[PDB]
Amino acid sequence: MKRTFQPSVLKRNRSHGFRARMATKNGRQVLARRRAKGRARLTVSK
Amino acid sequence: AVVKCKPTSPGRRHVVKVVNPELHKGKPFAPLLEKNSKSGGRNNNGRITTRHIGGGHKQAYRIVDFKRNKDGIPAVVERLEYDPNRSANIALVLYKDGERRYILAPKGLKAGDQIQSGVDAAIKPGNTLPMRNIPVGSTVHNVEMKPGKGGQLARSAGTYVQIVARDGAYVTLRLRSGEMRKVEADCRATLGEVGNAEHMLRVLGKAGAARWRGVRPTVRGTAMNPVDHPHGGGEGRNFGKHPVTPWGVQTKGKKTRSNKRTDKFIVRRRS
RNA sequence: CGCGGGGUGGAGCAGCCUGGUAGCUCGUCGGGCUCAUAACCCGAAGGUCGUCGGUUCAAAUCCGGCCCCCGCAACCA
RNA sequence: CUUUAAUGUUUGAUGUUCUAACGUUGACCCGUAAUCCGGGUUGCGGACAGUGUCUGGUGGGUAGUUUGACUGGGGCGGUC
RNA sequence: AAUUCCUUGUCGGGUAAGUUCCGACCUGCACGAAUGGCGUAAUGAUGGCCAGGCUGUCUCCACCCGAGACUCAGUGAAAUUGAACUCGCUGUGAAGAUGCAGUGUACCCGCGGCAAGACGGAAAGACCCCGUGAACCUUUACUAUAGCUUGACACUGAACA
RNA sequence: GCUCGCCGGAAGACCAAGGGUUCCUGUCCAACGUUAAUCGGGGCAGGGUGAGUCGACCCCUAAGGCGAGGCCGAAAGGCGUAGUCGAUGGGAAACAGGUUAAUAUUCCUGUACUUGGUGUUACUGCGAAGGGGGGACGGAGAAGGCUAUGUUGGCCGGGCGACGGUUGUCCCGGUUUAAGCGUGUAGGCUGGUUUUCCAGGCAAAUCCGGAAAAUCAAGGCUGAGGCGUGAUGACGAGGCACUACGGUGCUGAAGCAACAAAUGCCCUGCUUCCAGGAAAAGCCUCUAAGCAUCAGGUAACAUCAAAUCGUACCCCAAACCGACACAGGUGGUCAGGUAGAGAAUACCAAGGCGCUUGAGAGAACUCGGGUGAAGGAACUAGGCAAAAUGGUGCCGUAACUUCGGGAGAAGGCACGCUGAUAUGUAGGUGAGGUCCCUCGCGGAUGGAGCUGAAAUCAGUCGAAGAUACCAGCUGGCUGCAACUGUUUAUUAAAAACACAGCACUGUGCAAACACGAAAGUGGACGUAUACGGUGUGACGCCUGCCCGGUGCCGGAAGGUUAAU
RNA sequence: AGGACCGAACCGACUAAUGUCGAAAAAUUAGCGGAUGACUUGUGGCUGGGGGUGAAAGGCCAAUCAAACCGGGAGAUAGCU
RNA sequence: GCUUGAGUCUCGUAGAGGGGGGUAGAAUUCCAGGUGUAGCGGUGAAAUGCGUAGAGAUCUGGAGGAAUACCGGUGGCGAAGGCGGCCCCCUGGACGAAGACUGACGCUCAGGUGCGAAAGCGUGGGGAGCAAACAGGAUUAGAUACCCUGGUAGUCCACGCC
Ligand SMILES: *C(=O)[C@H](CCSC)NC=O
């Protein structure tokens, strides 16, 4: 077999990145919401 | 040459490698090349537009001139060259003024042959001439549609276009597919017939052959379930509908000749 | 358990659909041409239109019972 | 009234030519080193093609749903 | 016959014994000529039958070597469970009874075992039906629609035959 | 600490990735470890990661992303040019030894190397988003030459040994050495050089490309390893000396020959084959707009700078992913001895572990296996499971056939050990000596030494010699499918799908078709010997009859027929 | 030369047993199939929900598929329990 | 040794001898247009078919594939099969003339080799006409035959097999 969460920080930051979300239309509203709930970790990173 | 390989292993028993002993045994003219990354049949959106295209060997594109826009300049075909793109093995020609180029190779054209591009050239296999001064009733190839487009017809191996007649300003042509079309006399036709005619005798014997060329397998419609193809389903291949394209459009008898901006060109449609 | 169509000289079909007139091939009897049969040519006879009742000037026809026949039924955990 | 005939006149259907609309994934030049694009010369077609609107046909490629009940279980048959 | 319902069809071969198998006979319920027919060496973790070899598969198992099972010390679950002083039998009974009646039997209570019952435990039966429930799928089910296609008006003009 | 046992192409040693202090030290035992625990990857506390040469950042690009104007779209927004990002890619430069509780191609010692800045002196013309060469490349295969490395011997050091022999053809340990520089071989590639001219490379050109002349036959490019240097240096067995009894200081012999031999290197080679095998920059160089008492470039030299981030530890697993300290999965590199063809396997070296519950008992039964009387498929849905065959050379081998095969068909013989042929052969390698010389890493010749198949003969041991691990069961009739292959991951691996070939049909290029409201793309920078769709499915022999019904195509006179 | 044979690393997953509250939410054990190819694989990109992909099973799309997951319509509706 | 066998060289003759590459004319068919109109075609007769969507007939142009009227002759060449419009190129065999030259070098030949009408078969093109099978209409006691109308393979070309 092969479990389904391979660890790769690049892909962790390529399509879940602060600069990745803040880029497009939908992404900003998402970041708006996580701030809207008051969550500390918006999109996990370093 | 229809050189059949002996039946050693299964699959190898039906191979016909029409090899050639007249090409250059070596890597071609480096300056006349450029990369060519296949996109596998996908558009900008990324969705598979055309099926059966994926995988395959990497190829390098040789920029071949079809226009022949150099009047009155002698050239010599130094060596032939195998082409990963065409069926017509291109020929490396050296113009006598110090500039090498690639062009399709005619019938009996060999290494070291002299040619010339223009209205001044007489008749000999490989010479290119603005159609008017060509013997009405000859055989040509690489004819341009738009005088300056470059080259449009009969560019594959063993193909040729017969020039019917020049009535008025439009040349009556005859394609291999029998569709006689009128094109102005302003175009440029290269005399002769495209070489390497034994290309259509070449069989690939194995299944892996068509795959390393680049063609992905074709999944028949009587095998696909109704959800993925118009035909399909049934216990024992219960076929019984009318043959259509996987998108509903009826096939095996359906003229999709929907142009109308060029019917003034086509004189006699496919016989 | 039903629906659909039909039942017409010795064989089999026309005509029915849209009401006043019943036809064709073979066959039967026979003659002819042939030394003989067949084949063919030709003429005639042969049809209660399955049966009964109703209806209108006239019922093979339009309608209603009974009988006979073909296809499908004779099931699935 | 009908058969017809010259003309004035009012619209329509074809044939052909022309050039300014338009098309131009023809050549070339400039912006500009830039296969995008725009414009300018010229060539090739040509009032077509294409697009909007109205409209006839086709149309499971696609979509919204219907697809009766009783029934000595359902179904078949039958009935309402 | 991957097809033959009737059927283990019929004759022959193999076996002492052949509903399978092999070869033929055609009476093909209901083969069939690119939804291809008939053969086909080679290939096959393919389907079926047969012989040899070899063996515990079996006639009938037996012994032995280890890992658990058993005991002791430490740690310590689980599904399940209305309450329980929780026997068999005959009968009756919401229709197969540990619980009612009749009746025999039975000191109280553990452990190692084995699985007949508690219609045992696990899955608000996947089987059938119902619901004027849902969902995909088919088409000559009803109505629309993309696209394609016809023509007219417009962008769209000017001459003559 | 002394014995025993296990892996040893790993259960060993290092990295990427990814985790994030799990690394080391001291201390503590409740909670975590499926047991206890003064133990630990647990708690508390302290310490550790040192760089011009490693990776990355950085220069430059690929698939692809974003993308000022632009084309287009109800809006959002989509695609795309110039540009600008993006490695798994290409591009400059270092090795050995010693040390710490933990880190070191980074610290220290020694020995080296690279790209740039300013300055000095002597010469010389330099100069782009522009051109050219290079960079720069495929698969498989055979061969020559070496190295990492192993072994034997020689030599040095020690012993001659608790039960019989052991001063001898005896035994044990060591015998290690790079980067750079110089030389520049084996080998491979290519004819150099000089003159002139030119519609060629958007322009220029001395650079490249081309055509005629000329002289001579080599010059040049490239290149593992060896040899010298590096190094009268480092290291080095065993001793010499103090114990906090963990280890430290000091001293220091030999340090070579020979054979065998890689998948490593020469080789980003050579032959052959076809499915025809990146791009850009660094680098070398030519000129443009121009600038020349200049500025710059070349060469030698002095000095200076080389930043920032990561660097601990795990890294085929108790530290990653799987909720766990989980019999699973995880890319790359190094990878010894004997037998053996081998990275198989078995036993071992270096090195690391005994799997974090054990002590007794030997009951049924379960599980993993060993063995068996006579028979040998009578078992059963069915030869499922086990059992058996199993290696090398040679002999021999049918029906059938597409003449490749079938085939390792089936069935058989010889296999250990010792000596002799021959103080170990054929073969391979090969120093000294000798000769020559266009003198070097030379060419012949010469044969010491070393390594080492196999065949025959004789004798002998045992029941057995591929004695173990390792390691086909074979054949006959036949359906289906051609075959290799693919598939329902987590109940179906086949007769299903794919398949080369075949057939029809659509398509004249702004091609049909397809994604997309559009633009723009794929099709294809392909064009009828091409591309798309459908159907069957190698090969061989063939592939019949029906156009009523449906669909499609052609012909449209006429009837019906919307909008207007 | 080879979609060549035997057969490890590598990858896949035909048989039987054990396991099924397991060591493991499909593994191990002893044998198999392929292994120069239509091969396998690391790093990294593109195609997305009525859509993707598919050597085509209605399989696969984060242990979930004849139409994914999450949030909003929504306290949806139920002649039903 | 010789020559009356056989062979060869010098100069000429006839010829559908073979292969390869072009070219020419009439006729048939088809496509398009002009003119024009109820029949055309076929047969012993008739019908199928074709035609008022306008054929046939007729005129013009164009694209075609195949075979070569007359010359043509119990004429010619070749081993036989077989081969004829004309031209070019390569090329074979037979024959005549006056001499010379080598000097029996010959005849046939199982096995063996090659060539080899048509038809048929494979790969890839070509495809006008003609035309198995096949279909329709007739004939016929029946007609899967003779007739007619349409018509696929083939017939033709390059490389092979039989
Ligand atoms: C019939 O016995 C039924 C068939 C079920 S097939 C899924 N079996 C049980 O209900």
PDB file of C-alpha atoms (C1' of nucleotides) and ligand atoms in Angstrom, chain C residues 77, chain E residues 125-127, ligand 1:
ATOM      1  C1'   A C  77     -37.616 -16.931  -4.961  1.00  0.00           C
TER       2        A C  77
ATOM      3  C1'   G E 125     -32.996  -7.480   5.771  1.00  0.00           C
ATOM      4  C1'   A E 126     -29.159  -6.040   0.346  1.00  0.00           C
ATOM      5  C1'   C E 127     -34.428 -10.968  -0.965  1.00  0.00           C
TER       6        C E 127
HETATM    7  C1  LIG I   1     -34.083 -15.970  -3.178  1.00  0.00           C
HETATM    8  O1  LIG I   1     -33.979 -17.015  -2.539  1.00  0.00           O
HETATM    9  C2  LIG I   1     -33.233 -14.759  -2.791  1.00  0.00           C
HETATM   10  C3  LIG I   1     -32.334 -14.416  -3.988  1.00  0.00           C
HETATM   11  C4  LIG I   1     -31.468 -13.228  -3.616  1.00  0.00           C
HETATM   12  S1  LIG I   1     -30.313 -12.687  -4.953  1.00  0.00           S
HETATM   13  C5  LIG I   1     -29.561 -11.298  -4.150  1.00  0.00           C
HETATM   14  N1  LIG I   1     -32.385 -15.097  -1.646  1.00  0.00           N
HETATM   15  C6  LIG I   1     -32.593 -14.552  -0.444  1.00  0.00           C
HETATM   16  O2  LIG I   1     -33.484 -13.715  -0.228  1.00  0.00           O
END
